[PDB]
Enzyme design. Structure first.
Site, PDB file in Angstrom:
ATOM      1  N   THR A 264      70.035 -50.913  42.490  1.00 15.93           N
ATOM      2  CA  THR A 264      69.323 -49.708  42.141  1.00 15.93           C
ATOM      3  C   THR A 264      67.873 -50.009  41.731  1.00 15.93           C
ATOM      4  OG1 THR A 264      70.968 -49.746  40.345  1.00 15.93           O
ATOM      5  CG2 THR A 264      71.008 -47.901  41.813  1.00 15.93           C
ATOM      6  N   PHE A 389      69.972 -41.656  35.769  1.00 12.54           N
ATOM      7  CA  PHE A 389      70.876 -42.599  35.122  1.00 12.54           C
ATOM      8  C   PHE A 389      72.222 -42.022  34.698  1.00 12.54           C
ATOM      9  CE2 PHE A 389      66.547 -44.244  34.650  1.00 12.54           C
ATOM     10  CZ  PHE A 389      66.680 -45.515  35.149  1.00 12.54           C
ATOM     11  N   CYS A 396      74.185 -44.640  32.513  1.00 15.98           N
ATOM     12  CA  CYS A 396      73.784 -46.024  32.746  1.00 15.98           C
ATOM     13  C   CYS A 396      73.615 -46.813  31.474  1.00 15.98           C
ATOM     14  CB  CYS A 396      72.517 -46.076  33.589  1.00 15.98           C
ATOM     15  SG  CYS A 396      72.105 -47.731  34.162  1.00 15.98           S
TER      16      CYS A 396
HETATM   17  C1  LIG Z   1      66.733 -47.905  38.558  1.00 13.02           C
HETATM   18  C2  LIG Z   1      67.844 -48.408  38.054  1.00 13.02           C
HETATM   19  C3  LIG Z   1      69.171 -47.812  37.852  1.00 13.02           C
HETATM   20  C4  LIG Z   1      69.662 -46.584  38.225  1.00 13.02           C
HETATM   21  C5  LIG Z   1      69.013 -45.505  39.048  1.00 13.02           C
HETATM   22  C6  LIG Z   1      71.019 -46.547  37.729  1.00 13.02           C
HETATM   23  C7  LIG Z   1      71.858 -45.453  37.776  1.00 13.02           C
HETATM   24  C8  LIG Z   1      73.162 -45.308  37.240  1.00 13.02           C
HETATM   25  N1  LIG Z   1      73.844 -46.284  36.587  1.00 13.02           N
HETATM   26  C9  LIG Z   1      75.066 -45.725  36.237  1.00 13.02           C
HETATM   27  C10 LIG Z   1      76.089 -46.408  35.609  1.00 13.02           C
HETATM   28  C11 LIG Z   1      76.028 -47.762  35.209  1.00 13.02           C
HETATM   29  N2  LIG Z   1      74.932 -48.556  35.326  1.00 13.02           N
HETATM   30  C12 LIG Z   1      75.311 -49.815  34.902  1.00 13.02           C
HETATM   31  C13 LIG Z   1      74.450 -50.899  34.776  1.00 13.02           C
HETATM   32  C14 LIG Z   1      73.178 -51.092  35.313  1.00 13.02           C
HETATM   33  N3  LIG Z   1      72.499 -50.141  35.988  1.00 13.02           N
HETATM   34  C15 LIG Z   1      71.200 -50.602  36.130  1.00 13.02           C
HETATM   35  C16 LIG Z   1      70.164 -49.854  36.665  1.00 13.02           C
HETATM   36  C17 LIG Z   1      70.227 -48.526  37.175  1.00 13.02           C
HETATM   37  N4  LIG Z   1      71.335 -47.752  37.112  1.00 13.02           N
HETATM   38  C18 LIG Z   1      71.078 -51.922  35.552  1.00 13.02           C
HETATM   39  C19 LIG Z   1      69.827 -52.751  35.552  1.00 13.02           C
HETATM   40  C20 LIG Z   1      72.319 -52.218  35.047  1.00 13.02           C
HETATM   41  C21 LIG Z   1      72.823 -53.436  34.390  1.00 13.02           C
HETATM   42  C22 LIG Z   1      72.209 -54.468  33.986  1.00 13.02           C
HETATM   43  C23 LIG Z   1      76.712 -49.808  34.513  1.00 13.02           C
HETATM   44  C24 LIG Z   1      77.494 -50.991  34.036  1.00 13.02           C
HETATM   45  C25 LIG Z   1      77.144 -48.512  34.671  1.00 13.02           C
HETATM   46  C26 LIG Z   1      78.464 -47.973  34.201  1.00 13.02           C
HETATM   47  C27 LIG Z   1      78.363 -47.412  32.790  1.00 13.02           C
HETATM   48  C28 LIG Z   1      79.672 -46.954  32.211  1.00 13.02           C
HETATM   49  O1  LIG Z   1      80.301 -46.103  32.953  1.00 13.02           O
HETATM   50  O2  LIG Z   1      80.077 -47.278  31.103  1.00 13.02           O
HETATM   51  C29 LIG Z   1      75.132 -44.351  36.683  1.00 13.02           C
HETATM   52  C30 LIG Z   1      76.332 -43.463  36.488  1.00 13.02           C
HETATM   53  C31 LIG Z   1      77.270 -43.511  37.683  1.00 13.02           C
HETATM   54  C32 LIG Z   1      78.503 -42.648  37.606  1.00 13.02           C
HETATM   55  O3  LIG Z   1      78.485 -41.614  36.776  1.00 13.02           O
HETATM   56  O4  LIG Z   1      79.447 -42.859  38.352  1.00 13.02           O
HETATM   57  C33 LIG Z   1      73.947 -44.087  37.329  1.00 13.02           C
HETATM   58  C34 LIG Z   1      73.560 -42.863  38.103  1.00 13.02           C
HETATM   59 FE   LIG Z   2      73.083 -48.196  36.212  1.00 11.99          FE
END
Ligand SMILES: C=CC1=C(C)c2cc3[nH]c(cc4nc(cc5[nH]c(cc1n2)c(C)c5C=C)C(C)=C4CCC(=O)O)c(CCC(=O)O)c3C
Ligand SMILES: [Fe+2]
Length: 452
Positions: A264, A389, A396
């Site tokens: 992402t 997010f 996120c």
């Molecule tokens: C531009 C960057 C990013 C965008 C657009 C992004 C978007 C998301 N990240 C989500 C969940 C998540 N994102 C996550 C870790 C990361 N995500 C990251 C960067 C981004 N994460 C980075 C960097 C991470 C880790 C180091 C994790 C682990 C989840 C799950 C959270 C949970 O459900 O507890 C969701 C919810 C998805 C769902 O409801 O099914 C979105 C839309």
């Molecule tokens: Fe994420």
């Protein structure tokens, strides 16, 4: 009210409408035609796609709706099991892993990651500075090299050394192939047909490549001190139960963070750079801020927090092309959505994020224009209008990590180079469960400012 639904094809229902390499873009076109809500049916599925802030604000009420695993996420469970992304809120390992890993995303942890993020960003700058005059940059490719290396170093103290490889890292190759298979399974109505055996073998082969790397990360740590994401995974005990995560879940979390922690962000940086070369007035303004704030050879944590305009550019790239373009929800109990649409308990909703971000009621009539100025006063944006997010407790976990790294990287790029859209690149969005501008290329002319 009678719910709109697009064209049906007998027993296949709406399934043939998504017989494309770009399903999210096809759903946005249906949304434009049908409006704020439509029913979508396929052989084993019924879901409703939401596009207006009006209806999404209600769907984002945690007391009425919980996170659902879409068919897409259900397929990713074969790769990421019950890791944080692909787990139900009610599964034991969700709350357990969430509470154990949340401290890895604190302000103190972020201040600690900064130096390692600077290490990888310097490597990107040096690669581009070392190119010959004729040479161009394959932007998504190099953004993937940076983001994968950042999560590997910050989260697991492991160097992927992606900048020491001319082709994508083998982990990237297998991951992309695996996520593409998961996106395709949605259009595969008869999966047990012997004709699918070759895809199943390849899927299994790609999962092995990913798992071999997880094993190397684990082996490196036990032989190796550190207080990173892997440290919390191995030693953290859930405050509620008093027990740590099991070995099976730890492996799922590593795969989860390696995928979620980079794909992402890579897409965001590529999109942000695409919009900057297409809007030169905005590039100049962002480059001015970079030069004004980044007064030292390398950026400090404090300086990154002062890059307001760069942050607005990143939010405006996430408005137009949220790189995780959809999230699913389910009705916790029988309810009525928007006082017009009755839903039974368990009924599924899909939040179509690029459409939500195009709601003229919220953003004005210039929704398709790239204007970072929209985010000048973030208090003025209504609640649940901007959702890149996700939502609530399932939002996120890495949001702040991602924005810190993207701000730092984009600002260092703007400080050190002048960019040229030498091929007049036509936007081509590749979908692999996440979005990226496929084939995006630039030429970067060095401003000859040294590093440190
Ligand atoms: C531009 C960057 C990013 C965008 C657009 C992004 C978007 C998301 N990240 C989500 C969940 C998540 N994102 C996550 C870790 C990361 N995500 C990251 C960067 C981004 N994460 C980075 C960097 C991470 C880790 C180091 C994790 C682990 C989840 C799950 C959270 C949970 O459900 O507890 C969701 C919810 C998805 C769902 O409801 O099914 C979105 C839309
Ligand atoms: Fe994420």
């Amino acid at each position: 009210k009678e719910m709109p639904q697009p064209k049906t094809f007998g027993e296949l229902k709406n399934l043939p409408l998504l017989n494309t390499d770009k399903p999210v873009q096809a759903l946005m076109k249906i949304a434009d035609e049908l409006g704020e809500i439509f029913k979508f049916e396929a052989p084993g599925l019924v879901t409703r796609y939401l596009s207006s802030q009006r209806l999404i604000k209600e769907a984002c009420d945690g007391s009425r709706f919980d996170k659902n695993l879409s068919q897409a996420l259900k397929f990713v469970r074969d790769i990421a099991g019950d890791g944080l992304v692909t787990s139900w809120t009610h599964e034991k390992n969700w709350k357990k892993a969430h509470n154990i890993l949340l401290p890895s995303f604190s302000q103190q942890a972020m201040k600690g990651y900064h130096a390692m993020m600077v290490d990888i960003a310097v490597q990107l700058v040096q690669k581009w500075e070392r190119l010959n005059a004729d040479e161009h940059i394959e932007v998504p490719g190099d953004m993937t090299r940076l983001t994968l290396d950042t999560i590997g170093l910050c989260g697991f103290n492991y160097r992927f050394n992606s900048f020491y490889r001319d082709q994508p890292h083998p982990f990237i190759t297998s991951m992309v192939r695996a996520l593409d298979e998961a996106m395709n399974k949605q259009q595969r109505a008869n999966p047990d047909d012997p004709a699918c055996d070759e895809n199943k073998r390849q899927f299994q082969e790609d999962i092995k490549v990913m798992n071999d790397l997880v094993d190397k990360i684990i082996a490196d740590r036990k032989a190796s001190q550190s207080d990173d994401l892997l440290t919390h995974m191995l030693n953290g005990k859930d405050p509620e139960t008093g027990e740590p995560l099991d070995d099976e879940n730890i492996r799922y979390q590593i795969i989860t963070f390696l995928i979620a922690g980079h794909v992402t962000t890579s897409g965001l940086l590529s999109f942000a750079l695409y919009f900057l070369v297409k809007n030169p007035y905005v590039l100049q303004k962002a480059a001015e801020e970079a030069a004004r704030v980044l007064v030292d050879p390398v950026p400090s944590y404090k300086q990154v927090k002062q890059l307001k305009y760069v942050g607005m550019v990143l939010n405006e790239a996430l408005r137009l092309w949220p790189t995780a373009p959809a999230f699913s929800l389910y009705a916790k109990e029988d309810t009525v959505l928007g006082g017009e649409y009755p839903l039974e308990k368990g009924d599924e909703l899909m939040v179509l994020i690029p459409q939500l971000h195009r709601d003229k009621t919220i953003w004005g009539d210039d929704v398709e224009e790239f204007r970072p100025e929209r985010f000048e006063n973030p208090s003025a944006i209504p609640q649940h209008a901007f959702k890149p997010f996700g939502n609530g407790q399932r939002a996120c976990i890495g949001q702040q990590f991602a924005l810190h790294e993207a701000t730092l990287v984009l600002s260092m790029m703007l400080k050190h180079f002048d960019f040229e859209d030498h091929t007049n690149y036509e936007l081509d969005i590749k979908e692999t469960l996440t979005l990226k501008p496929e084939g995006f290329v630039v030429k970067a002319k060095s401003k000859k400012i040294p590093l440190g």
